[PDB]
Symmetry: C2
Subunit: 149 residues, 2 copies
């Protein structure tokens, strides 16, 4: 699902294929390093800090599944754990540096629970700025003091 | 499920009620700080570092559920996360100190995936010594260099 969004040879973020759409955080500079993906029609929402595009048939096989079911607990991500509690995601400060946008936070079954956009460093823990689902609805949760990765 | 095992006023470990049995790591000094539980008939296995006892009817309501289904990913415990990969559990060195025996490591649905007995500190991560299930069996996984908590 993850596809890197390069900008002049520099990887600036990522793009996941979640369900039937190809998502990419709007704020991220660059183009997707996948020929077929670059060529698609992207719709951009500044409200959600997103920029999605409906996936082509031949790539739908490599499309991940998403979910609203996000009980309190622990989730997985590129840089380990993500504590989830109080409708808030968190990672130990320093696991996520800039360039970590578009990465998914998934459950133990593979389902993508949310997509990182950036994070608010609040001591030992950084409260993540994310794109999350809501009974078939894409919401966006963002903490005060948030940077964009 | 967690019930503390005291020894002369000093809490030395814990005892969880998993399913229909009351488990307690054999190595732990002391008695269970619950009248009813102390009075039961305990069977001890030195093989599994366990000492279980079949739960009384009135306590079965407070009995937790267990499971063998443990896919790679992240789990929950008293001291945050537990990385689980390679049939191995791990926590960031320092989260688990002695006195943490008998604590359960559970999934996001509550099910108890394993019970801590101790751990081998191997740098930034400590590989936990645990009691885990296995398709209607109770196994014991323990790493070299393991202390007993």
């Amino acid at each position: 699902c993850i596809f890197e969004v390069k900008h002049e040879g520099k990887v600036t973020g990522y793009a996941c294929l979640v369900g039937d759409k190809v998502m990419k955080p709007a704020h991220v500079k660059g183009v997707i390093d996948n020929a077929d993906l670059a060529k698609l029609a992207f719709k951009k929402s500044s409200k959600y800090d997103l920029e999605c595009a409906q996936i082509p048939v031949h790539m739908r096989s490599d499309a991940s599944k998403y979910t609203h079911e996000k009980p309190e607990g622990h989730y997985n991500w590129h840089h380990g754990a993500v504590q989830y509690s109080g409708g808030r995601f968190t990672i130990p400060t320093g696991a996520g540096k800039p360039g970590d946008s578009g990465r998914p936070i998934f459950d133990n079954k593979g389902r993508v629970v949310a997509i990182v956009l950036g994070g608010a460093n609040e001591g030992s823990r950084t409260a993540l700025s994310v794109v999350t689902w809501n009974k078939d609805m894409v919401t966006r949760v963002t903490p005060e003091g948030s940077e964009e990765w």
